[PDB]
Ligand binder design. Structure first.
Ligand SMILES: O=C(CO)[C@@H](O)[C@H](O)[C@H](O)COP(=O)(O)O
Ligand SMILES: O=C(CO)[C@@H](O)[C@H](O)[C@H](O)COP(=O)(O)O
Ligand SMILES: O=C(CO)[C@@H](O)[C@H](O)[C@H](O)COP(=O)(O)O
Ligand SMILES: O=P(O)(O)OC[C@H]1O[C@@H](O)[C@H](O)[C@@H](O)[C@@H]1O
Ligand SMILES: O=P(O)(O)OC[C@H]1O[C@@H](O)[C@H](O)[C@@H](O)[C@@H]1O
Ligand SMILES: O=P(O)(O)OC[C@H]1O[C@@H](O)[C@H](O)[C@@H](O)[C@@H]1O
Lengths: 266, 266, 266
C-alpha cells in the first residue's frame, strides 16, 4: 500500500482531489467507456469535494462520463432528510458538477426488500465491469463503508447494524442527538470494496489514530476492516498529522521518506 | 461473521439444530438437487444430533435428500472400532434418521494410498458443486477439522498429524489412555471448509475459551485455523457462556446486543 | 506450512538442494514440458547452489530442461557489475550447470520503462503456466523477494524502494559501503510468489530471527510479507538453529517432532 503523510486535512483534500482528476483524465472516459468512481459521505471528504468542484469550474476535469457509486445509505431515514446520504451527495457534490443523473448510483434504504436492493446495487456495479477508483473514509472503530467490527472480509452489499461508537460520532450531524441517528445502514461489503481497481482512504484527525494504527501496523482481522486494504493490489491511505498519533515514529518516517517527492508540493 | 452468545451447551445444540432444519427446509432438497451438509464428530455436536433426531421424529425435517460429508477420520484405527468417526456418525446420527446410504460420505483412514483417498473425497464434494452448510467444532488449539496449528489457510483434504493437546483431549473417548488415540487423521482442509456456502462452528466449555478469543478477537493466522472464518462470507459461531471467558466484556456485549432478538427464545 | 528445523546452515543448503532435485526428477522435464524453478540471490542460497552443482556433476540432476526465473534485480546498477543479480546467478550457478541460455529469465533493471519490463516478466511467467517451485530467502525486515514492509499482499512484479535496513545488510557485498547499494529494485510481487505451486524459503542466522517469528508465530500482515506464506497451499521454510532464537520453545519442539524422520539424515 501507499501511505501519504500530509500535515493538515486541507492538504489531504487537495491530494485526494488531484489523484481523482489524474485517474479520470488519464482514463479518458466516454459514453461507451465511463470512468467508475466510488464515493463516501461523512465529514472527511468535504474538502475533496470542494476541491473537485473548483477544478471542474476551472475546466480541469469533467464528470460528464463519470459513473458514481456511493458506499452506503441509512435505513429508515427519509430520503429527503437533509442528512440522508442521498441529500449529502447532491447538496455537497452532484448539484455543483456536470455529472449526469443517469450515471449516479445510490442505495435506497427505504424499500420493502433490503436484500433485493443490495443485490440490485451489486448487479449494477457488475454491469460496468469494475469500479476504477473507490474513495472512502475510516470509522473510529476501523470500518470501511459500514463494515463494522466482526464483518466478513469477503462480504458483499448488505444491511449492517451501526455500532454505538459510529452512532455517537455521526450524531454530530443530528444536533448531537444520538436518538436521531439511524440504527442500520445498507453498505457495500469488504469484498465489494476490494473488487475496485484502486482504493483511496482519507484519514484525518486524532479520533482516527487507532484506526490508522490498525490499518498500517496491525494484522489482517475482521475487527478493523480497514486492515483488509493490506490484501488489495492498489490501496492508498491519505492522512494528516493528527491521525498518526498512535503510529511508531519509524513508521511515519518510513512513509514520509518514501513519498517525499510526491508530497513536497502539498 | 455472526457470533451467537447463548448461556448453556443445551441451547447451543437447539440453536444449531434449528439452523440446520431452517436451511434444509428452505432449500427444498430433491433427488436431483440434494442439500449438502458437512458434519463433525467429537463431543460438541452430540446435543445438536439428538435435537435433529427428535425434530425428524416429529416430522419437522427429512434427511431423505440430504447428502453428508464428514470433516475427518482417524488413520489406522479399525473402521468398526466404536470410536472411529464412521462408528460415531452411524451410532449417534445416521441410524436414527431417514438418510440414504448412498448419500453418506466418509473418509477411509485405512487405504493403502491416503493421497488418493483424500483426492477421491475432494472429487466427490465437487461432484455436488458445493457444500451448502458445514457444521464443525473447534479444537482447544484452535483447529477446525484437524487443521492443526501451522496448517495452510488454503489447504485441501490431506493427512495431518494430531497435536499432543488434541490427543490428550480426545483420550477421554479412549478410557483416558492417550496411547490408544491415533496419531494421524485424514481431514478436509481450511480451503475445503471455506468453499462451503455457510460455516457453523459450535463452541462450548471453558477449554475452548482461548480458541474463541483467537477466532473473534485475534487476527488471521495459521496457528489458530478457526481464525480463517474471518475470510468467509457466511460464518456463524454458536457458543455458550463458559467458552467466552477470554473475551473482553465489550465483545460479549456487542454480540449479545446484535443477536438479542435471535436468542431470546433459546 | 512445513518448517524444517536443522542445526546449521550447511544442512539447510543440503536439504534445499535435495528438495529441488526431488521435484525436478519426479517432474521429468522435457523441451515441451520444462520444470520451472524460481530462484533468489543473496548469501543464504550459496550453499544450496554449490550442492546443486555437485549433484549435477555427479549425474544426479540435469538442468537441460529447467527454466528459471529470478526474484529481482537492482535498478540502475550496471548489468556487468559483479554484484548485479545477473552476475551473481551466472557466476555462482548458471556457468556451472547444463542450463540452456534460452531457458534463463532475469529482470533488466536498466530499461527506460520499468513498468513494461515488469509486465514482460509477468507475461513470460504466464507463458509457462506456473512456476513449479520458487526458492527464496527472507529479509531481516521480513521481506520475500524485495516486497518490503507495507507491500501489497497481492502485489505483482514492480519497482520497489529498498529499506535502509535492507541496504545496510546488502552493503556487505559492496565493501561495507551503503552508498554503493542501489536504492531501488525490480521485484516479483507477493501475488507473483503465491502463484507458484510450491514455495521454499531458506532462513539462516540470528539476524533473521525476528523475521522467522513473524513468519511462523505472527499473523498475516503487510509489514512482514513472509507472513503471506500462511495463505499458500504448499510452503516450506528451512531454517537453522540461530534463526529460531525468537520462537517459543514449544514452537521449535512442535516442528522438530513433526519433521523428525525427515531431518534425521541431515
Ligand atoms: O462509508 C462511510 C460514509 O459513506 C463511513 O465509512 C465513513 O467514511 C466513516 O464513518 C468516517 O466518517 P467521517 O469521520 O468522515 O464523518
Ligand atoms: O473435526 C473435528 C471432529 O470431526 C474436530 O475439529 C472437533 O470439532 C474438535 O476437535 C472439537 O472436539 P470436541 O471438543 O467437540 O470433542
Ligand atoms: O529476493 C532476495 C534476493 O533475490 C531477497 O529477498 C533475499 O532473499 C533477502 O534479502 C535475504 O538476503 P540474504 O540474507 O540471503 O543475503
Ligand atoms: O458477516 P457479515 O455479513 O459482516 O454480517 C454479520 C452480521 O452483521 C450485522 O451488523 C448485521 O445486522 C447482521 O444482519 C449480520 O448477520
Ligand atoms: O501445510 P499443510 O498442508 O497444513 O501441512 C503441513 C504438514 O502438516 C503435518 O501435520 C502433516 O503430517 C504433514 O504431512 C504436512 O506436510
Ligand atoms: O503497494 P505496493 O505495490 O507494494 O507498493 C507501494 C509503494 O512501494 C514503494 O516501495 C514503491 O517505490 C512505490 O512505487 C509503491 O507505490
Amino acid at each position: 500500500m501507499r501511505l501519504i503523510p500530509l500535515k493538515a486535512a486541507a492538504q489531504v483534500g487537495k491530494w485526494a482531489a488531484a489523484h481523482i482528476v489524474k485517474r479520470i483524465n488519464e482514463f479518458q472516459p466516454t459514453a461507451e467507456r465511463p470512468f467508475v468512481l466510488g464515493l463516501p459521505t461523512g465529514g472527511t471528504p468535504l474538502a475533496t469535494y470542494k476541491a473537485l468542484i473548483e477544478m471542474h469550474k476551472a475546466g480541469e476535469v469533467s464528470f460528464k462520463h463519470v459513473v458514481t457509486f456511493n458506499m452506503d445509505e441509512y435505513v429508515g431515514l427519509a430520503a429527503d432528510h437533509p442528512e440522508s446520504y442521498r441529500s449529502f451527495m447532491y447538496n455537497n457534490f452532484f448539484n455543483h458538477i456536470d455529472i449526469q443523473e443517469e450515471n449516479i448510483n445510490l442505495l435506497n434504504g427505504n424499500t420493502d426488500d433490503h436484500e433485493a436492493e443490495c443485490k440490485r446495487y451489486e448487479d449494477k456495479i457488475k454491469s460496468y465491469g469494475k469500479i476504477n477508483l473507490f474513495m472512502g473514509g475510516v470509522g473510529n472503530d476501523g470500518h470501511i463503508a459500514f463494515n463494522e467490527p466482526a464483518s466478513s472480509l469477503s462480504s458483499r452489499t448488505r444491511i449492517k447494524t451501526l455500532t454505538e461508537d459510529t452512532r455517537i460520532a455521526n450524531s454530530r450531524f443530528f444536533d448531537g442527538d444520538i436518538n436521531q441517528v439511524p440504527k442500520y445502514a445498507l453498505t457495500i461489503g469488504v469484498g465489494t470494496l476490494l473488487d475496485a481497481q484502486e482504493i483511496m482512504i482519507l484519514v484525518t484527525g486524532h479520533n482516527k489514530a487507532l484506526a490508522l494504527q490498525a490499518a498500517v501496523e496491525g494484522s489482517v482481522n475482521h475487527l478493523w476492516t480497514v486492515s483488509a486494504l493490506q490484501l488489495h493490489p492498489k490501496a492508498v491511505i491519505v492522512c494528516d498529522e493528527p491521525s498518526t498519533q498512535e503510529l511508531k515514529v519509524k513508521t511515519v518516517k518510513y512513509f514520509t521518506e518514501l513519498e517525499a517527492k510526491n508530497i513536497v508540493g502539498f
